[PDB]
Amino acid sequence: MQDEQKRKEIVAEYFRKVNEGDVDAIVEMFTENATIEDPVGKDVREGRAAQREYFNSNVTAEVTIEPGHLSAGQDGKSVAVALAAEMTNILDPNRTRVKINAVDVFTLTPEGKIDSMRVFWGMTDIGVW
Amino acid sequence: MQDEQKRKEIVAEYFRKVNEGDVDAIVEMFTENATIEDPVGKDVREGRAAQREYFNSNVTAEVTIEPGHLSAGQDGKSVAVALAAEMTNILDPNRTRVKINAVDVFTLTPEGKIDSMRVFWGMTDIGVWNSSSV
């Protein structure tokens, strides 16, 4: 959306749906050709198949997100927000929960669909206990 | 810097120097043709010059920054951080401060210098806060 408030509300709803773990509902928030860059500097994920794989991987990892303040850009489409993500590695037989402190930047269409997400987190943004 | 900890330590210094009000020292942390886009979307300063227009008006605005956690990109150069910036309230200079909740994204050089900064904040990211207990 181009209205800041409404734009933020769509991102808030995205995090609610990540938390709910409902892949189909999450994927439908994105445009069909939306790109996801997670982490920033690795391979860009592009289109529906890649989104699906990425969100299945997140729900499988039992991700929970606690978002910080949602900041709007003044470009009619961006939202940027620091978050704490917690998740489990499904290959770890101890299923140990890890925290990642990340920053997400979204851009949205004027109809309110997400068309890019970039996720900043590095090796040194990961914590345990 | 390509090493995440080093890259972060540099941005940590940037905020320290901003809070110190030392325009000389701040401007220097940038490269010659660094772009500062603040706010994102009403772009886009470029150049050693406009970085002094920039840093001088921050000092004039009595800006203080409280950064949160510094996250790194895995692109060998980005740092991204949510912060709270407080400054003078011109509508009520003496009684209140304006607070903006923003996200900064920096990209840095392999030497340690800032090439770009995009500061995300909107009209809905501004609060007014009590400033004195007179």
Chain A residues with CB under 8 Å of B68 CB are: 68, 82
Q: Which two tokens stand for residue A14?
A: 């995205």
- Cα B16 to Cα B48, B73, B118: the distances in Å are 20, 21, 18
Q: Strand B71-72 vs strand B64-67: parallel, antiparallel, or unpaired? A: unpaired
B106 alpha-carbon distance from chain centroid: 9
Comparing CA positions, the residue from B21, B25, B45 lying closest to residue B33 is B45
Task: For domain A1-129, give the CATH number.
Answer: 3.10.450.50
Structure determined via: X-ray
Q: Which two tokens stand for residue A124?
A: 């040194």
SS3 A85: strand
Sequence-distant contacts of A126-129: CB under 8 A, at least 24 apart: A126/A98, A126/A99, A126/A100, A127/A98, A127/A99, A127/A100, A127/A101, A128/A96, A128/A97, A128/A98, A128/A99
Comparing CA positions, the residue from A70, A1, A73, A69 lying closest to residue B121 is A73
User: Are the beta carbons of A78 and B105 separated by less than 8 Å?
Assistant: no
HSE toward the beta carbon, residue B69, CA cutoff 13 A: 21
Listed in sequence order, the DSSP H helices in chain A are 4-20, 23-28, 48-60
Listed in sequence order, the DSSP H helices in chain B are 4-20, 23-28, 47-60
Considering only the beta carbons, identify the residue of B42, B81, B122 that sits closest to A103.
Answer: B81
Class of domain B1-134: alpha beta
Chain B interface, Cβ < 8 Å to A: 4-5, 8, 39-42, 68-69, 71-76, 78-82, 101-103, 105, 120-125
SS3 B45: strand
Q: How far apart (Å, rounded) are the C-alpha atoms in residues B30 and A17?
A: 40
Give the phi and the psi of residue B26 in degrees, each rounded to 5: -65, -55
Interface probe, candidates A106, A117, A120, A121, chain B, greatest B C-beta count within 10 A: A120
Q: Which two tokens stand for residue A10?
A: 């769509």
Is residue B8 within 8 Å of A121, Cβ to Cβ?
no
Structure's resolution in angstroms: 1.8
Residue boundaries of the structural domains of chain A: 1-129
- In eight-state DSSP terms, residue A124 is G
Is residue A27 within 8 Å of A55, Cβ to Cβ?
yes
